[PDB]
Symmetry: C2
Subunit: 314 residues, 2 copies
């Protein structure tokens, strides 16, 4: 039962958290063929540490690895340290640049601890932002696509107030997001997807009865996309379209429009993809779990589910 | 097996559609005790017509009835006529005023035909609005509660642009809506409900990182409601709370926040409650079905499900 059909970069996240642990446990479960498609980015010391704990010493030899985020002192399982914050970022930075340059086709990032990163002096508002910085893009040109229960919902805005989101929406922004998410769909194994665009306002404005935004923003975006030769329905009322369940990719205007479906239908088995240039970075949708770090009791299910998704055949 | 534990007004909707039929079929299935709790509002001629068709003449004597929406000519099963549009409205107007004055505790409206009403010259944008007009209230003082798959979600705003909705939210507005919906919960048979309030902004603002609205609007509303002695969690990120599924009443700020959960999880089996000034009005959630009007193929299940909900025991 083979889940990895392409080259992937795995960055092991906070070297003090469960990242290293779950990395190894997840490579354990693969055939050797599959393991050699996964390049691991992170400090060797932490993978040593997690191996002695998990009793997986055999698997270090049979592992493709690039040193990133090296440590100047021994690993301290469970401690929040400025150093470990830097490791995380360097490791993730490394894997992204191997995707950017084409050594791999996507990145998976193991958990971070935000305190550790802040304490290192690094601005971090998530993987959308980090991914932008590293690539030299604007933060509004990288987007978040959630994937769970077969719904793929890309978000035009994310993690700002509604108002701020509203005063940023534009025909161009929607277009960029759909383009990013369609190139991503090809990676996920839906090369030619049928897209549905959510309305900004309820019922997609209902012409212009419930506001003018849709007529100014979504409708002109949809026309452009169709002309470029994409199959694209809408704008339609978010509630209505999601119920039909007849699309491969939904496009949401506001955070909640996309996050409510996903976390309702797949509250732990969802994946969060950051999409920018040709880089698709997914998180493993759990924290660094410092409380259990180094006790070898951390589950890799989420990491395997994430690999299965970005490692997909079509 | 008794589903009606209080006094209800049943308005028979379009007197040409299946309303009359399903009314009678639905009263058929009740005990006589339960039938005397249900006052029927509509033209007698149409209930006569539907009774001769269905062969239920015995049940007209055993029926509490108030003439509303009288017709000046014989009933025409299946025809869209200006007259029948007026009947619907008069009947529904009547039942609401019997709730308003306290003769009954809630109203159920059988199906309407929008064309018929428009052709009579009457503005109708739904039961929220009609209920406002009849009661002499502002349309933002009536609130919509959707009910389906166990979720009860009251909406603070509804059927206006996000922006307009945003610039109307205020501590008082939230409070009004929760009060209305908690009174309604008592009718629905959850006297002492555990409430969750959705954030305006993603993640309920995250302190004030994602905007100030929540700190100005939802937090001050929640504090007030707790002090009045209500069990009330939040504000919380809509996506997060709905996933826990640990509450009897959710409170949504924007239309979509509430309508996406419902239509996704119960695209067929759901109820829309309009709430204002002691009145709870539900529809039956199917159209008037003119093509089978008088042809005795219409089942009353949806009408009975609606009665079971508004007729619930304390
Ligand atoms: Mg708006
Ligand atoms: Na993130
Ligand atoms: Na107000
Ligand atoms: Zn989020
Ligand atoms: Zn609606």
């Amino acid at each position: 039962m083979t889940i990895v059909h392409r080259r992937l970069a795995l960055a092991i996240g906070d070297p003090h958290g469960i990242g290293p642990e779950i990395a190894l446990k997840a490579l354990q479960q693969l055939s050797a063929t599959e393991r050699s498609l996964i390049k691991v980015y992170g400090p060797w010391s932490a993978l040593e540490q997690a191996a002695q704990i998990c009793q997986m010493e055999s698997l270090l030899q049979d592992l493709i690895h690039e040193e990133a985020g090296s440590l100047a002192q021994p690993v301290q399982c469970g401690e929040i340290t400025p150093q470990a914050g830097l490791s995380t970022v360097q490791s993730a930075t490394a894997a992204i640049r191997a995707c950017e340059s084409g050594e791999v086709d996507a990145v998976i990032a193991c958990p971070h601890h935000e305190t550790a990163i802040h304490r290192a002096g690094i601005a971090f508002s998530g993987y959308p932002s980090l991914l932008a910085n590293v690539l030299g893009m604007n933060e509004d040109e990288v987007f978040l696509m959630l994937v769970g229960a077969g719904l793929r919902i890309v978000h035009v805005t994310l993690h700002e107030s509604v108002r701020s989101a509203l005063e940023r929406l534009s025909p161009q922004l929607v277009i960029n997001a759909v383009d990013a998410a369609v190139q991503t769909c090809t990676l996920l194994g839906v090369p030619k997807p049928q897209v549905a665009v959510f309305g900004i306002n309820p019922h997609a404005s209902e012409g212009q009865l419930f506001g003018l935004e849709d007529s100014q923003i979504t409708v002109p975006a949809v026309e452009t996309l169709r002309k470029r030769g994409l199959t694209v329905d809408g704008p339609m009322g978010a509630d209505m379209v999601l119920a039909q369940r007849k699309h491969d990719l939904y496009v949401a205007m506001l955070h909640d429009q996309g996050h409510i479906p996903i976390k309702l239908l797949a509250p732990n088995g969802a994946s969060a993809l950051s999409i920018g240039g040709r880089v698709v970075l997914s998180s493993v949708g759990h924290g660094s779990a410092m409380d259990i770090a180094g006790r070898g009791v951390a589950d890799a299910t989420a990491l395997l589910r994430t690999i299965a998704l970005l490692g997909a055949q079509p």
